[PDB]
Design a protein around this ligand. Structure first.
Ligand SMILES: CCCCCCCCCCCCCC(=O)O
Ligand SMILES: CCCCCCCCCCCCCC(=O)O
Ligand SMILES: CCCCCCCCCCCCCC(=O)O
Ligand SMILES: CCCCCCCCCCCCCC(=O)O
Ligand SMILES: CCCCCCCCCCCCCC(=O)O
Ligand SMILES: CCCCCCCCCCCCCC(=O)O
Ligand SMILES: CCCCCCCCCCCCCC(=O)O
Ligand SMILES: CCCCCCCCCCCCCC(=O)O
Ligand SMILES: CCCCCCCCCCCCCC(=O)O
Ligand SMILES: [Co+2]
Ligand SMILES: [Co+2]
Ligand SMILES: [Co+2]
Ligand SMILES: [Co+2]
Ligand SMILES: [Co+2]
Length: 584
């Protein structure tokens, strides 16, 4: 593929709207400090040129590559040295040194102030009176604050925001319609950003063979009709894409992703029937659509796994030939038969098979050792399926909020060293995971759980590893991504914990609670419970339930009477002393 102008060629394939979006994101992930209206100029300056070249590729500078045009344009920026400093020094570099120089001088935390959400009225009003300026500003604002976030992915999110505004701004109780959707998108925004980063860290730390294992597992579930060769092909293609995107070049990453889809949509018949709609969709959309594609039908009359991977003298031979191609096959075969399983569960099986196979092989006669490998799998399978039942049962009894509280207590006792604000949010978000996935039938519970659990455990591990307080959490966090959730599951109640000293103000409450969002109210209620538990690790549901119900009664009482503030302090003082006796 070669065009005289690539800038002319890109302008057409993407379409001007997507084109004017990306360029804005592009120049916003670099030049995070420059004001909006400047970028808007720059965007338009590019966009004019882009059009000059669309009209005639022979036009001057149209021939020059995106990498050259983009770089030249960045060096055009006046006050580049005043604000961007060493980034300016990049301009004396000749491509591809200069482009690499730019990537290096991205700032992952520009110390920009928190992006504050206006009131619904203000947004809808601005949205109406100025749609583009409204939407682009925030696109700009998000892209500069998140310079490594994959630009197309950001764009897909921006078009969803537009949707929520368009629907909600027309209706009554817009805030009721809108605020949910805006949080939902934000939560997803973080999840996406974290999931992207988790893909790159895993590849760096645990390596590429690990990466591919995770990939084989996942694709074999996604594409059960495909042969091991074809999975294996796609796994090696997919890893390379990740390896280019983790470096952080957008164009290269995008081209690799586009290529990988191009291939997939040509060989649909070889992979999955579910690709048809995705492949019709436009290029940016196609890559996204493949990633999210439904699992294909698992072929019927599938042979038992105990034939090829047990009951076969050649296994010890074949394992040795290629430890990874055989193991990979086993994973492929096990996985395509188990879409109901979590990716990490399948790796625990493959890992087990390998450990068994290596130890068994070259010792005595192998058959007698490798005979019971499949039995070793059953305990591993049961453990995560047990937890789902136990948790989804308790969830259905208690309901989300109360479930979050059951969680809060449990975890505080295990890891009291963790900051209250972190204990709350993790316990809240875990509530949401069981809320979402317990609604699924027995199948798809684990794959649902895994993906949602990964984000929460990552949020915590990312947040904790900046300010560590627990060796037990650190161990889990810096452990293999296969063993990460089991480690957390394994955490036992720490007997060594010296309780938190009482403080009145913590357990003091004001009438402000009465008029407050339930979430905000819950957070503070929830906060007190954590503090309560940190004070009294030797508290027990029998004793704890009492105190929680008296607090339930203390709050409904004062918020009901006319002079709430007096009640709150005076009743609280009773509530404290009473409870303090009840827990000691
Ligand atoms: C990637 C999204 C670009 C367009 C966003 C439209 C405006 C979003 C609402 C204003 C800021 C919301 C902040 C937040 O949700 O935390
Ligand atoms: C909020 C904007 C959502 C679009 C994706 C960008 C990354 C979101 C992270 C938001 C956050 O840090 O709370
Ligand atoms: C993209 C396939 C290979 C990925 C191998 C590393 C996986 C790291 C953990 C990913 C957690 C998020 C799960 C997901 O991708 O939906
Ligand atoms: C830090 C240099 C590597 C750049 C990799 C870019 C693509 C993966 C990361 C995207 C999410 C960034 C999250 C973060 O680091 O805060
Ligand atoms: C399941 C098959 C996936 C085919 C699509 C290619 C996915 C490669 C991901 C490259 C990094 C993009 C980061 C993101 O998800 O925003
Ligand atoms: C760091 C966590 C993941 C480590 C890998 C655990 C599973 C072991 C078997 C790996 C199979 C390799 C197959 C392949 O790469 O083609
Ligand atoms: C705390 C919320 C509970 C929701 C249900 C999930 C229970 C944990 C089981 C996780 C199994 C998938 C991950 C893994 O294989 O380790
Ligand atoms: C700091 C909070 C730690 C959260 C750990 C969550 C582990 C996955 C949930 C599965 C249920 C087991 C919980 C546990 O044993 O701690
Ligand atoms: C022993 C010191 C005084 C303790 C006062 C009560 C502490 C627990 C308050 C938070 C738990 C209530 C949550 C709820 O029932 O919704
Ligand atoms: Co093209
Ligand atoms: Co109007
Ligand atoms: Co490439
Ligand atoms: Co998506
Ligand atoms: Co789901």
């Amino acid at each position: 593929d070669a065009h005289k102008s690539e800038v002319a060629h890109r302008f057409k394939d993407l379409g001007e709207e997507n084109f004017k979006a990306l360029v804005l994101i592009a120049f916003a992930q670099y030049l995070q400090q420059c004001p909006f209206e400047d970028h808007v100029k720059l965007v338009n300056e590019v966009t004019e040129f882009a059009k000059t070249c669309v009209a005639d590729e022979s036009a001057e500078n149209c021939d020059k590559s995106l990498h050259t045009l983009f770089g030249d344009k960045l060096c055009t920026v006046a006050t580049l040295r005043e604000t961007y400093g060493e980034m300016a020094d990049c301009c004396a570099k000749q491509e591809p040194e200069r482009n690499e120089c730019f990537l290096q001088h991205k700032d992952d935390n520009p110390n920009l102030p928190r992006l504050v959400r206006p009131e619904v009225d203000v947004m809808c009003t601005a949205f109406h009176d100025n749609e583009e300026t409204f939407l682009k500003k925030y696109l700009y604002e998000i892209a500069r604050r998140h310079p490594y976030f994959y630009a197309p992915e950001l764009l897909f999110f921006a078009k969803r925001y537009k949707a929520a505004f368009t629907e909600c701004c027309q209706a009554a109780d817009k805030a009721a319609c809108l605020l949910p959707k805006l949080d939902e998108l934000r939560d997803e925004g973080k999840a996406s950003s974290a999931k992207q980063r988790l893909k790159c860290a895993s590849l760096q730390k645990f390596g590429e063979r690990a990466f591919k294992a995770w990939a084989v597992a996942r694709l074999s579930q996604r594409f059960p009709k495909a042969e091991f060769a074809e999975v294996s092909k796609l796994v090696t293609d997919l890893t390379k894409v990740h390896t280019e995107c983790c470096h952080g070049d957008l164009l290269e990453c995008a081209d690799d992703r586009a290529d990988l889809a191009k291939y997939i949509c040509e060989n649909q018949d070889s992979i999955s029937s579910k690709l048809k709609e995705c492949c019709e969709k436009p290029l940016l959309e196609k890559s996204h659509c493949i990633a999210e594609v439904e699992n294909d039908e698992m072929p019927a009359d599938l042979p038992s796994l105990a034939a090829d991977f047990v009951e076969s003298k050649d296994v010890c031979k074949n394992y040795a030939e290629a430890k990874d191609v055989f193991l990979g096959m086993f994973l492929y075969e096990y996985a395509r038969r188990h879409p109901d399983y979590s990716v990490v569960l399948l790796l625990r099986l493959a890992k087990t098979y390998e450990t068994t196979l290596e130890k068994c092989c070259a010792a005595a006669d192998p058959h007698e050792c490798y005979a019971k490998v499949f039995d070793e799998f059953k305990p591993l399978v049961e453990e995560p399926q047990n937890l789902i039942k136990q948790n989804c049962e308790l969830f259905e009894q208690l309901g989300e909020y109360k479930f979050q509280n059951a969680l809060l207590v449990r975890y505080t006792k295990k890891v009291p060293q963790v900051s209250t604000p972190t204990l709350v949010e993790v316990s809240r978000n875990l509530g949401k995971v069981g809320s979402k996935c317990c609604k699924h039938p027995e199948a798809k519970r684990m794959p649902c759980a895994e993906d949602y659990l990964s984000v929460v455990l990552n949020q915590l591990c990312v947040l904790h590893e900046k300010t560590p307080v627990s060796d037990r959490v650190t161990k889990c966090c810096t452990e293999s991504l296969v063993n990460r959730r089991p480690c957390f599951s394994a955490l036992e109640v720490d007997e060594t914990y010296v309780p938190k000293e009482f403080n009145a103000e913590t357990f003091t409450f004001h009438a402000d609670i009465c008029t407050l969002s339930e979430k905000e109210r819950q957070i503070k209620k929830q906060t007190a419970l954590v503090e309560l538990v940190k004070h009294k690790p030797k508290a027990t549901k029998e004793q704890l339930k009492a105190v929680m119900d008296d607090f339930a009664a203390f709050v409904e009482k004062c918020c009901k009477a006319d002079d709430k503030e007096t009640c709150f302090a005076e009743e609280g003082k009773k509530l404290v002393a009473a409870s303090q006796a009840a827990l000691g």
